[model samples]
Target: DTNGFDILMGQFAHNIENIWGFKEVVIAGPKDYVKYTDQYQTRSHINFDDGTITIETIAGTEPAAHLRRAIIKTLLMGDDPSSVDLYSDVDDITISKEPFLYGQVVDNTGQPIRWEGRASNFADYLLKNRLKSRSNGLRIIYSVTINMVPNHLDKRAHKYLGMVRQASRKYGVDESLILAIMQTQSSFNPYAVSRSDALGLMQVVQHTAGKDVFRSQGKSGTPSRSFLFDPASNIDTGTAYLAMLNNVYLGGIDNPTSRRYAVITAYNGGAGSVLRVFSNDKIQAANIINTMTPGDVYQTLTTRHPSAESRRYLYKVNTAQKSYRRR
Candidate 1:
């Protein structure tokens, strides 16, 4: 039997702080089912807040190739969120999940360099200086950090800043809110795909947000995985969907905060769910939302929204948006 638990508790463990939403941690790959493997698991994070790629691997003198493999995984995930395999070709049971989601290689020894080269170039780079780190007892952890974003970049949103701005402008959505949703949705993983098949960084589900966006735009098609895989298209569709919620579906609430609360909630769970919390009737539900203070609206959502996921989602987006405020 395929060990289902490891297949699904699936999100890689993250050690970074989650509240301020400085950056997101994607567990690059699964640890041995922890049931039958001896390889030490490495913990890592790509912090957009400071533009660094930090890999902390605790094992005595890992091969540069091994560490480089980890760095490439981190870079691909953060660089553009590539769909990496659950199993590389050399596994025992080779039949694989076709759309396994997964990144680039970068390094720093107090300066930055990117690797887009062949075997010899990489081997040469690593052998030249090798990764140096402080050791703790028998645990010789090799931690390497690189400034992933060059100077003159918007560190928080990184590569997606332009796409975010374009989509925000096109859809009339708040720039901070779009960035917050993207971060909350996929941690800026351009190739991030939700289990629900919400594709790309903004996690646009073709049937839900994607369809809604296209329909609202006076367009006539559903976005494909290929389209949503695009960082630009994903943000555009996602922001348009958010705008559609704010400007139309959720347009009736008087208070900005209250509307935002609903938008964030609806984005996760949809407008109908946000409305049904107060009333079955659309107008009455909106009226009910407006009657409460924005604080009350927030409390109501976090406490009463049907999906636990959406409730937590509202809080995450709200909290995450604050960090993107000056972005």
Candidate 2:
């Protein structure tokens, strides 16, 4: 019977030819594989009947590692590998692994619905472990299977959900709201760090927001940069910050939803930016906060906030919050 691996290898070979401009390239036995491996520092052995292809990195170079990642990503996305453009520099290569991050939602019975790798760099690690099809080859094996769901949050929630729930209860925040923030902030990646140095599950800026959270709780010490990476510390600090925004800053607003919206705006735009919304024009800002409906707060933040990113953050968190509820 024909399988996904068969289709993948056929397409991959075509891509190697069309995209890489290696017109004479062919998948063959171990002896012939050495020529390509020696020249390009990459080798692959295909078993058509078994629906397996073992790729090895021979040069122990970064470019080879990236090429291997790109090939796997291309196959997983079901894209023509030849459609990918290679760079002379390994760091210059960018391959979209979004398909694996958010797996397909449709029912794909008896078809490969998911792929995972245990190694830091699956291809390179496979080679290092001497797991290749050939004796002298370093290779990684991929399994094809169905019945796997690809929602990253669902798969990883158990690791951090308990902490989120505990923090939410302790801080008087809604569990779903905490979960929503987590989903939007770092997608529950415990080690996630933003370009701006916001770290961990809630992307807390340790020096600024983290300090505030610590101070508010009467903790005396300064939090280290790595403190935000700790799942409990990250959640506790983030939830505490949210509590301050909700209960202390937006507390005067009567509507819970309006208060929540304003708090979210502050979370992204900085407490100062939120305060400035009422600073210069105190009467107007106070009136808006005091009388505006929840929908009005949304509209006000959308139009009045100076930072477009903060505005987008509001939208993302709200959307993510709704999705979390549904799930």
Candidate 3:
């Protein structure tokens, strides 16, 4: 089937799946916006790492008015997340008001059907259009590349705060900690995927946090992408998994503070690896950990953890947690 949403998702998923540490959103737009985006015709790519979003659209052979209306509305959609439909990606996003960001529609591939990308004003762009298509007109990609310099970091967090709070309360995990993970893991993009096939906001690998969380509930199965993509489900699963590390798996640690640091590393490297940081024998590791100060435990994990990623992960989580005022 010719689906606009699928084309958008697939185009985005291919580029975003292995990437982390940034966010992209699809704010809701008008109800009939779907008709404009079909056939992989229009696509958007947001790269927070580089602080830019690139978009392209191919005009279909439709009425000039309908075509012009769909093009701008789809590319420069609304900024409100509440209107975000399942059919679209984040609409007309923003960065802090700065002379730093500007947009340029650098192509005119929409020949025969029309050319609207060159219009400088919103009114001019919407009202102006070339004549409709000929019998053999080509449907090619014409992109509107909007360069942006973004600010207002907290505004992005507003999208998922309530969802994170319940997961925090339900799992007894600190709300700030979950926020940090959301920031660190996927940079607040619910649709995020990772190189290891880890999916959604928390980047939970199915065999790791995903299955383990399911196992904890006497449930047995992996979380589907559709499930993980929802902020509600991913946050709840990730928060629940974090709590399991803090209160259950790492519970043997005598110091709560020590367990907290350990939980962060364990979240990245698994509890067994965290324990193995001290000794291969977990019983021996637990005993040694109990004797150390939380500070000592912190140093050891940061300095000697098995994987370099896990070691660095401890510091990043703690650093970001502080931004959220998590003790």
The segments of candidate 3 whose C-alpha lies over 4 angstroms from its true place after superposition are 1-43, 56-149
Task: Please provide, for model 1 over 11-122, each residue's C-alpha lDDT reduced to its tens digit, 9 standing for 90 to 100.
Answer: 2222222311223323332111101011334544454333455655554555454566554443333232333322221112111222111112233333223333432343
User: In model 1, what is the error at residue 64, expressed in angstroms?
Assistant: 6.9
* Total backbone collisions for each predicted model: 8, 1, 9
Top candidate when judged by TM-score against the true structure: 1
lDDT of 3 by residue, 185-261 (tens): 76665445554556666777766788889999999887765676666887889998998898888888878888899
Error (Å) of candidate 2 at residue 40 is: 18
Measured with C-alpha atoms, the lDDT of residue 82 in candidate 2 is 22
**Candidate 2 residue lDDT tens string, 1-327:** 234534654565574454234533444321111113324345433222232334444344464454455334422443221222121112222234443223322222323323534222444443354343322333322222111244434754666788988998899998888888887776665545454557677878766788888888889765765567677888888999999988776676677898788788888777668657755554456556777777888888877788998888888898888876674
Clash pairs (backbone) in predicted model 1: 75-104, 76-103, 76-104, 77-103, 82-102, 83-102, 84-101, 84-102
> Rank order by TM-score, top first?
1, 3, 2
Clashing pairs in 2: 127-138
Worst 10 residues of 1 by lDDT: 29-38
Indicate whether candidate 1 or candidate 3 has the larger TM-score. Answer: 1
lDDT of 1: 0.62
Stretches of candidate 1 above 4 Å error?
A: 1-108, 115-156
